[PDB]
């Protein structure tokens, strides 16, 4: 039950990029494709917890 939102690039493979976002530095936030038609396993779902 903890929330953290941050997009700063980190030293994934040492040699900290500090915003360089070069080689060995991969972005933390990845997006979703969510094709209009696709397999049920890769189709968006909506979930709510009470």
């Amino acid at each position: 039950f903890e929330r953290d939102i941050s997009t700063e690039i980190y030293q994934a493979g040492n040699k900290p990029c500090n915003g360089v976002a070069g080689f060995n530095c991969y972005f933390p936030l990845r997006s979703y494709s969510f094709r209009p038609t696709y397999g049920v396993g890769h189709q968006p779902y909506r979930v709510v917890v009470l």
């Binding site: 493979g13 080689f23 060995n24 991969y26």
Partner: protein, 50 residues
């Protein structure tokens, strides 16, 4: 699986489905080694079909 990371001045790779982190800890039965030559623009075609 940790080849030299000064391998070349320009290098591209994208692992989908397998996290490069702690790649030594996770392991499989057999691994194949392959060699290819594809032009600079066409290397994007190495993917699940596309």
């Amino acid at each position: 699986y940790s080849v030299l990371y000064n391998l070349a001045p320009f290098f591209t790779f994208k692992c989908y489905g397998v996290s490069p982190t702690k790649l030594n800890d996770l392991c499989f039965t057999n691994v194949y080694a392959d060699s290819f030559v594809i032009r600079g623009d066409e290397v994007r075609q190495i993917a699940p079909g596309q």
